[PDB]
Amino acid sequence: EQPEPRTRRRAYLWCKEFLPGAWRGLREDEFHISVIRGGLSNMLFQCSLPDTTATLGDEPRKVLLRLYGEAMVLESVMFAILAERSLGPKLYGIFPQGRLEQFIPSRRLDTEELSLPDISAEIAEKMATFHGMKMPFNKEPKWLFGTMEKYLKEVLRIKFTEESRIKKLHKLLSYNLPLELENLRSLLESTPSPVVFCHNDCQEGNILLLEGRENSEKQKLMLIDFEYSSYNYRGFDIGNHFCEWMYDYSYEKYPFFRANIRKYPTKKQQLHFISSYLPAFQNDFENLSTEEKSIIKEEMLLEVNRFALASHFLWGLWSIVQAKISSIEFGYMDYAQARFDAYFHQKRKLGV
């Protein structure tokens, strides 16, 4: 797929002006560009040198161009920090209309792969590593309930025009969400979880399987797409990831997802995950007694399964608001209903 000749021009100039080596002397007629994702918000292109052109130093042959649609400053700083620490794609250029990033040959994981033991173990290690790092952002964990409050308030003010959405919203408001948010607050306020640097969206579509490295046991993945990252309760990040075993966003018919409550990880599979996470997050952990390890692990199961409720609640509210304001083709209200179904199922499973 080719873009319009006007974006093609703009892109040529960005690469020419921002990238060093052979790129600096490159002519419009030798510029290769093609699409990866299009639309109206976060559009991706692969830009490259022609195969016949030689590099002059260590510049990339090929790069990723990301066109964009307080928060703008924070996301850029963080993208740069991760790039410097080699935990994210390198940052090659930053401008108002977009940015230029390392191109990493890879594919996203499919939902079904999240439960493969070796995949699950590595995701845990990465998340653990990510949780341990220092970032220059606010460390009060106010984003979880602050955000749930903000969306709840919008949700109560929403008037849809189409009858089917009006009906679906009416079924959702029937649960008395402001009362349910307070119950979830008191449950989570009594559930200790250390505040750490969370990804907050650790789903299959934000996990890259790296080309070439498929045979590596423990080093085949990269976490990406940190736009929702913040300091937050650890339980949310793990609980949210566990929830993601149940949703597959690649389904081609409406509503463009498939949900399965029986795909939530078993106790066994949860233990496999936290057995990799704990040593990578608390370095002394491997040298505790058998019995002390079991205690930590059992309290962690309770922790993450409780915070899983906040994953369902938050993304459910989010999705209702998106049904009003997003143009993207997705059955947002059906998804909201699926998250609230799972919420009430998980409440029953926990006895809370």
Give the residues lining the site for ligand 9X1 (CB under 6 A). 68-76, 94-96, 143-144, 147, 200, 227-228, 230, 232, 236, 314, 318
**Tokens 């085949």 — which residue?**
220
Which residue in the set 26, 33, 74, 209 belongs to the binding site for its own copies (CB under 8 A)?
74
Residue 11 CB, nearest distance to ligand 9X1 (Å)?
A: 16
Is 102 labeled as ligand-binding?
Answer: yes
Taking the complex as a whole, the smallest distance from the CB of residue 98 to its own copies amounts, in Å, to 12
Is 127 marked within a binding site? no
- Provide the 3-class DSSP secondary structure of residue 200: coil
User: Under rule CB under 8 A, how many of the chain's residues touch its own copies?
Assistant: 29
Q: Is 107 annotated as a binding residue?
A: yes
Residues forming a β-bridge with 189: none
User: Is residue 222 a contact partner of residue 211, using CB atoms and an 8 Å limit?
Assistant: no
The residue count for the chain? 352
CB–CB of 49/78 below 8 Å? no
Q: Quick one: what does residue 69 bind among ligand 9X1, its own copies, none, with the CB cut-off 5 to 8 Å set by partner type?
A: ligand 9X1
If the CB atoms of residues 195 and 301 are measured against ligand 9X1, the closer one turns out to be 195
Are the C-beta atoms of 331 and 297 separated by less than 8 Å?
no
Minimal distance, residue 74 CB to ligand 9X1, in Å? 5
Encode burial over 117-156: b for 16+ CB neighbours within 10 A, e otherwise.
eebbbbbbbbbbebbeeeeeeeeebebbbebbeebbeebe
Q: Does 18 bind its own copies (CB under 8 A)?
A: yes
Q: Is 42 annotated as a binding residue?
A: yes
Tokens of 285: 């952990």
Tell me which amino acid residue 141 is. Answer: P
- 110 labeled part of a ligand binding site: no
CB of 314 to ligand 9X1, least distance (A): 6
Q: How many CA atoms lie within 13 A of 23 on its CB side?
A: 24
> Of 73, 190, 267, 325, which one interacts with its own copies (CB under 8 A)?
73
Distance CA 31, CA 46 (A): 11
Q: Which is nearer to its own copies, 93 or 255 (CB)?
A: 93
Decide which of its own copies, ligand 9X1, none touches 100; Cβ closer than 5 to 8 Å per partner kind: its own copies
Measured CA distances, 273 to 25, 97, 156, 197 (Å): 50, 39, 37, 18
- Which residues in the 105-144 window bind its own copies by CB under 8 A? 134, 136-140
Nearer to ligand 9X1, 19 or 49 (CB): 19
**Residue 147 interacts with, from its own copies, ligand 9X1, none (CB under 5-8 Å by kind):** ligand 9X1
Max Cα distance, the chain (Å): 68
- HSE-CB of 343 using CA atoms within 13 angstroms: 22
* Inter-residue contact 92 to 171 (CB < 8 Å): no
Give the separation between CA 319 and CA 321, rounded to whole angstroms.
5
Report the nearest approach of ligand 9X1 to the CB of residue 99 (Å).
7
CA end-to-end span of the chain: 51
Query: What does the alpha-carbon distance between residue 24 and residue 350 come to, in Å, rounded to a whole number?
Result: 60
- Name the minimum Å distance from CB 140 to its own copies: 5
CB atoms under 10 Å from CB of 314, counted, come to 21
Residue 91 interacting partner from ligand 9X1, its own copies, none (CB closer than 5 to 8 Å by kind): its own copies
- Residue 225 is assigned to a ligand binding site: yes
Q: Is 169 annotated as a binding residue?
A: no
Here the tokens at position 344 are 């009430």
Shortest separation between residue 266's beta carbon and ligand 9X1, angstroms:
25
Residue whose CB is nearest to ligand 9X1 in the complex, by number:
68
39 is in an annotated binding site: yes
Is 106 flagged in the annotation as binding?
Answer: yes
Q: Which residues bind its own copies (CB under 8 A)?
A: 17-20, 24, 70, 72-74, 76-77, 80-81, 84-85, 91-96, 99-100, 134, 136-140
Binding-site residues from annotation for phosphocholine = 39-41
